[PDB]
UniProtKB/Swiss-Prot annotation, chain A:
Entry protein name: Complement component C8 beta chain
Subunit composition and interactions: Heterotrimer of 3 chains: alpha (C8A), beta (C8B) and gamma (C8G); the alpha and gamma chains are disulfide bonded. Component of the membrane attack complex (MAC), composed of complement C5b, C6, C7, C8A, C8B, C8G and multiple copies of the pore-forming subunit C9.
Glycosylation: residue positions: W13, W16, N44, N186, W462, W465
This protein's record includes keyword Secreted: yes
Regulation: Membrane attack complex (MAC) assembly is inhibited by CD59, thereby protecting self-cells from damage during complement activation. CD59 acts by binding to the beta-haipins of C8 (C8A and C8B), forming an intermolecular beta-sheet that prevents incorporation of the multiple copies of C9 required for complete formation of the osmolytic pore. MAC assembly is also inhibited by clusterin (CLU) chaperones that inhibit polymerization of C9.
Record domain EGF-like: where: 416-446
PANTHER family: COMPLEMENT COMPONENT C6, COMPLEMENT COMPONENT C8 BETA CHAIN
Domain MACPF: 101-415
Membrane topology category: Multi-pass membrane protein
InterPro entries assigned: C8A_B_C6_EGF-like, LDL_receptor-like_sf, LDLR_class-A_CS, LDrepeatLR_classA_rpt, MAC_perforin, MACPF, MACPF_CS, TSP1_rpt
Pfam families: EGF_C8A_B_C6, Ldl_recept_a, MACPF, TSP_1
Domain TSP type-1 intervals: 7-60, 456-501
Subcellular location: Secreted; Target cell membrane
UniProtKB/Swiss-Prot annotation, chain B:
Record-marked site positions (Not glycosylated): N13
Organism expressing this protein natively: Homo sapiens (Human)
GO molecular function terms noted in the UniProt entry: complement binding; protein-containing complex binding
Domain LDL-receptor class A: 64-102
The keyword Flavoprotein appears for this protein: no
Highest rank taxon of the organism: Eukaryota
Listed name of the protein: Complement component C8 alpha chain
Swiss-Prot record, chain C:
Lineage: Eukaryota, Metazoa, Chordata, Craniata, Vertebrata
Location relative to the cell: Secreted; Target cell membrane
GO BP term, pick one: complement activation, alternative pathway
Domain MACPF: 1-208
UniProt-annotated glycosylation sites, renumbered to this chain: W255, W258, W261
GO cellular component, one term: extracellular region
Post-translational modification: C-, N- and O-glycosylated. O-glycosylated with core 1 or possibly core 8 glycans.
Principal subcellular localisation of the protein: secreted
Entry's family note: Belongs to the complement C6/C7/C8/C9 family.
Illness: Complement component 7 deficiency: A rare defect of the complement classical pathway associated with susceptibility to severe recurrent infections, predominantly by Neisseria gonorrhoeae or Neisseria meningitidis.
UniProt protein name: Complement component C7
Keyword set includes Disulfide bond: yes
Length: 501, 513, 298, 177
């Protein structure tokens, strides 16, 4: 009816880019023009073609390795790392055929809990962890033991420190309001008349005007938030050891710019890597409840009657009304968010009641072993493209810059048509999901019983850069004009941006 | 309401059997399902696909699907040579390991770690029409020489040693080995609970009355008049929705050089490059229509309660009543009016996905902090794919390590575009009153709400019959206009009942011929 | 209103050696090595960003615990009743012209009731902890409304756990340029780092931030100033809500940014600030510090 | 109250030209800091040029007689094959050295429970602890055990630290009104 399925449209293919001298391949791609929404046709997967080429062009991809070139993986490990007892290559290709193995450390050592999670790239726009980009199981030498409690851990070479800067911060707020008003009026009257002589004349009257007018309201806002920080993590600034899969995939990138191939890079590994993080858990609880009661009562009666006796004639009227109305309403919204820890505690914290201090203790204990990543400072993944292990490193870097800039545009949810019901459209891929708040339901959040639903305004996509002499972008707010249904908070961010060409 | 006709199941005659495929050596034929028994009636008492034994006219396909790559024996899988003698069996035969004098790699920092529990569950195919999981599409077990490990964040298992009196956490299961077919398996733990509860009540009560008399005596005689309107109205609405989903791990499948399941590899090589719908429909049947490319392991709890009651009463009366007496004569007459409309609807859904049968059932029956905790405890051991992104089963062909298979991909695409509509629940007819048509492969039923059923969820005591429509099945493709083609559908199976929601999607669709 | 202000220290101190005998961390020394040997403030700022402005010459490890808990509730009930009742009844009759009678008796009532009641019940609490086990932190910082300071046992246990995961709760600081060592041009990089420290303290000086009301501490966060409102005050300036606890009142004076160095004329640089940001008002205290500095030329 | 949009200053003159990297940087001051939710300044404060240097890149002076860690830090040759990692990151002093040469240099290696935190830098404006600056586990070949009476455990101090001690102080203000 109102929502109508929107089919995915993707661009006409780009031109075939010229055959890459090193990849001996040629590439074309389609932009996604609009995502599928409301169960519209999901177009098709594979918005990118790669073709074989014959190329005379020379390729200088033979980046020198003074070290040991791993047989299967081709990682260039330092010659000193052979026969140290660590698999610094893949498939022990550095430890194979060792006359003797000089075990760099004899003690059992753990890896820091969850450390490999941080070696994944992060899609900063989606804010989603993706494929592995750094090798946090490469130690080089290492074997300086780090004790946290009794457990001694072996720090990865990539990691500048992981350290238990343990902290926690609980915020509780409970604001209850009540109002009632309760009015009554009881007007009442009688009249009586008699006369006589031989005659009689009796005239009685009654009147009632009774009114009741009651209104009670109760409101509760109850917000609780535990922020628990259990460790702090920083990646080294320099000379990082990349993951095999990422190394390869980057080596596959063409030197001539081809957006689709870099886009596939970002969709596999994301856009950024975590250079520093705070690891912890978040528990947040927020209960909003409003209750109103209203009663209306309005009774009226009249009697008007007479009789005269001389023979007798009597006359009379009764009139009555009882108008009674009783509007009553409750609206209760509870959202619980829990991040980090064990499933058991995550779930029972996700119950609708506030927890016991016992359960908060158990949860925070578990969070130490399976922490969420509370805060990250991230650098774009092109900063990992370095001359040390890629040929044409500057070219690949620049192409990643350009592809990142375009990727940010393409992946922006703003392409999505506005959700009803103060839905939040999220671009899952070729397809956009309306996340419906509590009290909103269905594909567009169209099904909501709530009488009013304040629509916080959603920016439209930033209009393309204007030309130089004040290169500028503007936004219109048109996409979800807030005012309907009593719009809520207008968009905080910049409505327009200016840049010096 | 009235039942439809319990029309019998009806099939096409058998198609003529294909030749005895050189390896399977089996005569394949199909009979298309023209119409399933819409409800009850004469079922089709047989298969739709049949496969008679034979003896082949010629040699099985060349037992040499690849050069230099080591080919296993029962399975056509081609292994890059470093996978031979790597200390783990890269194919069902073990032919890569079971004759090695020594192993080129030992992987003594992975081979202790079991595969990620539940990884096999993400590898299943998926039958969109049934929502059943199908046979393994991906290889849940092949590691491809990768030694990749996933930190098991919930490793921390409590142990007690009576001798030491030490109560401590056993360090077993600390890491799991990631199968090669996963690009990521993230193990991030999240919960979100959103709850909305809404209550609305109204009454509007309005008694209104007059009474009147005039009476005279010299005989004594009376006339009295009465007029009244008594009206009563009530509305009572309760809605509450509880949705608590608990992610325990995100995963993303590898989209490049997918290693298909060896059973799937068999079933796929065995497929002829000719559109014998019977075979292709069998492949879509047992591997299903779709395979998962991404998703989340976890649990979901959804509980919805809707109660709606309305009661309207209007009572009118007029009368005139008279006396004459001095013995007595007494008279009267009038009009009585009553009109009523009353409807009550109560509808509760409590569905729990993931977590053990017993403890998920306990949370399904009785929501409490005890059942939330025991359910979450059971989610550690038995998570489920709670959300996923999937592609049509033919789409894996383009991405499998076998390389191009385009004839078979096109044939399977066509077979799927057929199957999706031949076996579609649209053909189970008009389940009234929000009844849910399901086609159990050959027999239809309407899963009804909590009320009476005789044929089509019609007998339900729901005279407040406000219930949503559903589409008739898509009409057959138009005789295309030499390049463009159209399909038509109507919101008439059932029609939207007495103001129920019109069917949401397309009333007409169009296709390039 | 509760305040809990609470420390356990249990590494009474550490004292780091002087910069001569300190061993630099390998990545820090690597970043010093890559400093450009020239005043490229971009590089030194990236250094001060990653490693900060100082290192801990000495300090004590421990844990901090604070609870601010505030309960404020008011209940008001107003109830009025009025009633008016009147009768006027008279009879007049005659017997000496024509036997006659007349009677009339008239009644009115008019009752009225009006009741109103309002409650507000606001409760706020912010337990904060550093140090100790994450589980003891979350158990203790979870506000128990019947015992908002936290029960004895749980504080016991946390104060034990902070033995094992103590945090630096008190420190004495040495400028980071003192560690510039073991590197090419170390002597020169040490001066350029000192100049970078002064440039950075300039760039992030809260002087740039025009005042927050209600004593909100303005801090430069990159290019822009947040106001960190004091408890239960909020808004862009902290213009809204009310301070809990006791305040001396007025507006405290804040320093303007230092004027630029006079170029060491006669070998003395001099620079001035004005304490106009804001001018101390309403009996608020003067800004604290000297109006001017002088230094030897570099 | 009123926001104030951040305005960038003009770019400063370029830096002198780096011999090591053949580049210069400019800086923009923030002419007017954004306040009260005024839009922050957008883009980088710095821009960089390729440039022809006047300066040579100063070389490393190698370790001379001392042992050279793989990072290029230098340590006393007496520390090689201590059985202790004295090359901070790479432990290159312990590479490929005999099971006879590595001594029982100390019976315990467990540093005090968070002595790593004593080596962090500190940012005095933001009040935040920053990243690792001092190697607080350089044992210098000493077996400098200390018994913590608090933790009731033996810990090995670094060779440098002037003191590390475990006497507790507990300092409680309650104030209820
Ligand atoms: C207006 O009239 C109503 C109806 O008579 C009054 O309600 C009665 O009050 C008495 C005294 O409190 C009770 O004993 C009765 O049970 C009440 N009746 C009902 C139906 O509730 C009401 O008090 C009057 N209001 C005012 C302000 O005088
Ligand atoms: C649900 O559990 C509670 C507590 O055990 C019990 O009182 C209640 O009767 C149960 N209800 C059902 C339907 O099981
Ligand atoms: Ca090695
Ligand atoms: Ca093998």
């Amino acid at each position: 009816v109102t929502l109508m399925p929107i089919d995915c449209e993707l661009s006409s293919w780009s031109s075939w880019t010229t055959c890459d001298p090193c990849q001996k391949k040629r590439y074309r791609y389609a932009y996604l023009l609009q995502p599928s929404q409301f169960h519209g046709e999901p177009c098709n997967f594979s918005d990118k073609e790669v073709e074989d080429c014959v190329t005379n062009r020379p390729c200088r991809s033979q980046v020198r390795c003074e070290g040991f070139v791993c047989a299967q993986t081709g990682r260039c490990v330092n010659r000193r790392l052979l026969c140290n007892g660590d698999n610094d290559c893949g498939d022990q290709s550095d430890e194979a055929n060792c006359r003797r193995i000089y075990k760099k450390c004899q003690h059992e050592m753990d890896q820091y809990w969850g450390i490999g999670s941080l070696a994944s790239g992060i899609n900063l726009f989606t804010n989603s962890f993706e494929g592995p980009v750094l090798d946090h199981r490469y130690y080089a030498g290492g074997c300086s033991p780090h004790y946290i409690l009794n457990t001694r851990f072996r720090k990865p070479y990539n990691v500048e420190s992981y350290t238990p800067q343990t902290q926690g911060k609980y915020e509780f707020i409970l604001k209850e309001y009540e109002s009632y008003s309760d009015f009554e009026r009881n007007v009442t009257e009688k009249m009586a008349s008699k006369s006589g002589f031989s005659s009689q004349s009796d005239r009685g009257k009654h009147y009632i005007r009774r009114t009741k007018r009651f209104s009670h309201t109760k409101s509760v806002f109850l917000h609780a938030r535990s922020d628990l920080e259990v460790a702090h993590y920083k990646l080294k600034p320099r000379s990082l050891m990349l993951h095999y899969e990422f190394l390869q995939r980057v080596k596959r990138l063409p030197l001539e710019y081809s957006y689709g191939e870099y886009r596939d890079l970002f969709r596999d590994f994301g856009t950024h890597y975590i250079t520093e993080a705070v690891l912890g858990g978040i528990y947040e609880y927020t209960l909003v409840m409003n209750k109103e009661a209203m009663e209306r009562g309005d009774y009226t009666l009249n009697n008007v009657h007479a009789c005269a006796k001389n023979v007798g004639k009597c006359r009379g009227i009764l009139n009555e009304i009882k108008d009674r109305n009783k509007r009553d309403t409750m609206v209760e919204d509870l959202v619980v968010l829990v991040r980090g820890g064990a499933s058991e505690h995550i779930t029972t914290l996700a119950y609708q009641e506030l927890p016991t201090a016992d359960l908060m203790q158990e949860w925070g204990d578990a969070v130490q072993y399976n922490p969420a990543i509370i805060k990250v400072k991230v650098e774009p993944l092109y900063e990992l493209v370095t001359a040390t292990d890629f040929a044409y490193s500057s070219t690949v870097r620049q192409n990643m810059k350009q592809a990142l800039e375009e990727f940010q545009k393409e992946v922006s949810s703003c392409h999505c048509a506005p959700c009803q019901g103060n839905g939040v459209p999220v671009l899952k891929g070729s397809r956009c999901d309306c996340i419906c708040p509590v009290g909103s339901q269905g594909l567009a959040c169209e099904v909501s019983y709530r009488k009013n639903t304040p629509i916080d305004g959603k920016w439209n996509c930033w209009s393309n850069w204007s030309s130089c002499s004040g290169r500028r972008k503007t936004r219109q707010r048109q996409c979800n004009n807030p005012p309907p249904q009593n719009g809520g908070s207008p968009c905080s961010g910049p409505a327009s941006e200016t840049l010096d060409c | 309401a009235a039942t439809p006709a319990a029309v019998t199941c009806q099939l096409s005659n058998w198609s003529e059997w294909t030749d005895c495929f050189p390896c399977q050596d089996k005569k394949y034929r199909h009979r298309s399902l023209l119409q399933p028994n819409k409800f009850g009636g004469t079922i089709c008492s047989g298969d739709i696909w049949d496969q008679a034994s034979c003896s082949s006219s010629t040699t099985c396909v060349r037992q040499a699907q690849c050069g230099q790559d080591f080919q296993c024996k029962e399975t056509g899988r081609c292994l890059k040579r470093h996978l031979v003698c790597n200390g783990d069996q890269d194919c069902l035969d073990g032919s890569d390991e079971d004759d090695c004098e020594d192993v080129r790699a030992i992987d003594e920092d992975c081979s202790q770690y079991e595969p990620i529990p539940g990884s096999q569950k993400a590898a299943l195919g998926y039958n969109i029409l049934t929502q059943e999981d199908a046979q393994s599409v991906y290889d849940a077990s092949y590691y491809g020489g990768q030694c990749e490990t996933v930190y098991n964040g919930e490793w921390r298992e409590l142990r007690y040693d009576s001798t030491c009196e030490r109560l401590y956490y056993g360090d077993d299961e600390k890491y799991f080995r990631k199968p090669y077919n996963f690009l990521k398996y993230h193990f991030e733990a999240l919960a979100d609970t959103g709850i909305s509860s809404e209550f609305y009540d109204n009454a509007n009560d309005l008694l209104s009355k007059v009474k009147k008399d005039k009476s005279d005596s010299f005989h004594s005689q009376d006339t009295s008049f009465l007029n009244e309107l008594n009206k009563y109205n009530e509305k009572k609405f309760i809605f509450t929705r509880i949705f608590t989903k608990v992610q325990t791990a995100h995963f993303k499948m590898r989209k490049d050089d997918i290693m298909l399941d060896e059973g799937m590899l068999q079933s796929l090589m065995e497929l002829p490059d000719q559109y014998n719908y019977g075979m292709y429909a069998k492949f879509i049947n047992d591997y299903g229509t779709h395979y998962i490319t991404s998703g989340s392991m976890g649990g979901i709890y959804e509980y919805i309660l809707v109660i709606d009651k309305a009661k309207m009463e209007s009572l009118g009366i007029t009368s005139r009543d008279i006396t004459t007496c001095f013995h007595c004569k007494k008279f009267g007459g009038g009009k009585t009016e009553r009109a009523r409309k009353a409807m009550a609807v109560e509808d509760i859904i409590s569905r729990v996905r993931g977590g053990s049968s017993g403890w998920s059932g306990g949370l399904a029956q009785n929501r409490s902090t005890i059942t939330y905790r025991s359910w979450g405890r059971s989610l550690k051991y038995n998570p489920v794919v709670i959300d996923f992104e999937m592609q049509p089963i033919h789409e894996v062909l383009r991405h499998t390590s076998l390389g191009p298979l385009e004839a078979k991909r096109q044939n399977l695409r066509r077979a799927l575009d057929q199957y999706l509509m031949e076996f579609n629940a649209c053909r189970c007819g008009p389940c009234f009153n929000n009844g849910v048509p399901i086609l159990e492969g050959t027999s239809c039923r309407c899963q009804c709400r909590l009320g009476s059923l005789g044929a089509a969820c019609e007998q339900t005591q729901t005279e407040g019959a406000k219930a949503d429509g559903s589409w008739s099945c898509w009409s057959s493709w138009s005789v295309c206009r030499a390049g463009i083609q159209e399909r038509r559908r109507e919101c008439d199976n059932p029609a939207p009942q007495n103001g129920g929601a019109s069917c949401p999607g397309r009333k007409v669709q169009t296709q390039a011929c | 209103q509760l305040l809990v202000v609470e420390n356990t220290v249990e590494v009474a101190q550490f004292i780091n050696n002087n910069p001569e005998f300190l061993q630099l961390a390998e990545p820090f020394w690597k970043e010093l090595s890559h400093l450009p040997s020239l005043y490229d403030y971009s590089a030194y700022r990236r250094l001060i960003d990653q490693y900060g402005t100082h290192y801990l010459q000495s300090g004590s490890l421990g844990g901090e615990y604070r609870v601010l808990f505030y309960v404020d509730s008011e209940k008001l009930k107003q109830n009025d009743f009025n009633s008016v009742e009147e009768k006027k009844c008279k009879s007049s009759g005659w017997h000496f012209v024509v036997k006659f009678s007349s009677h009339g008796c008239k009644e009115l009532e008019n009752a009225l009731k009006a009741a109103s009641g309002t409650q507000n019940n606001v409760l706020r609490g912010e337990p904060f902890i550093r140090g100790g086990g994450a589980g003891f932190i979350s158990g203790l910082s979870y506000l128990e409304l019947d015992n908002p300071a936290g029960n004895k046992r749980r504080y016991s246990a946390w104060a034990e756990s902070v033995t094992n995961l103590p945090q630096v709760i008190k420190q004495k600081l040495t400028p980071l340029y003192e560690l510039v060592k073991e590197v090419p041009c170390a002597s020169v990089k040490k001066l350029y780092l000192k100049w970078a420290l002064e440039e950075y303290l300039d760039e992030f000086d809260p002087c740039h931030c025009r005042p927050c009301q209600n004593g909100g501490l303005a801090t430069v966060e990159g290019t822009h100033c947040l106001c960190h409102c004091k408890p239960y005050t909020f808004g862009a300036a902290c213009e809204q809500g009310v301070l809990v606890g006791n305040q001396a009142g007025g507006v405290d004076g804040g320093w303007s940014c230092w004027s630029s160095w006079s170029p060491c004329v006669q070998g003395k640089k001099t620079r001035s600030r004005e304490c106009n940001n804001p001018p101390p008002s309403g009996g608020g205290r003067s800004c604290v510090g000297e109006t001017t500095e002088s230094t030897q030329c570099e | 109250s009123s926001p104030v949009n951040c305005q960038w200053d003009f770019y400063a003159p370029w830096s002198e030209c780096n011999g090591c990297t053949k580049t210069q940087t400019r800086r923009r001051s923030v002419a007017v800091y954004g306040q009260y939710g005024g839009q922050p300044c957008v883009g980088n404060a710095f821009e960089t040029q390729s440039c022809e240097p006047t300066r040579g890149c100063p070389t490393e002076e190698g370790c001379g007689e001392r042992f050279r860690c793989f990072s290029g830090q230098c340590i006393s040759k007496s520390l090689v094959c201590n059985g202790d990692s004295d090359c901070d990151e790479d432990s290159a002093d312990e590479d490929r050295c005999e099971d006879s040469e590595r001594r029982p240099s100390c019976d315990i290696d467990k540093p005090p429970p968070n002595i790593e935190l004593t080596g962090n830098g500190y940012n005095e404006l933001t009040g935040q602890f920053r990243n690792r600056v001092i190697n607080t586990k350089s044992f210098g070949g000493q077996c400098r055990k200390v018994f913590s009476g608090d933790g009731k455990d033996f810990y090995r101090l670094s060779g440098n630290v002037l003191s590390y001690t475990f006497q507790v102080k507990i300092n409680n203000d309650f104030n209820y009104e």
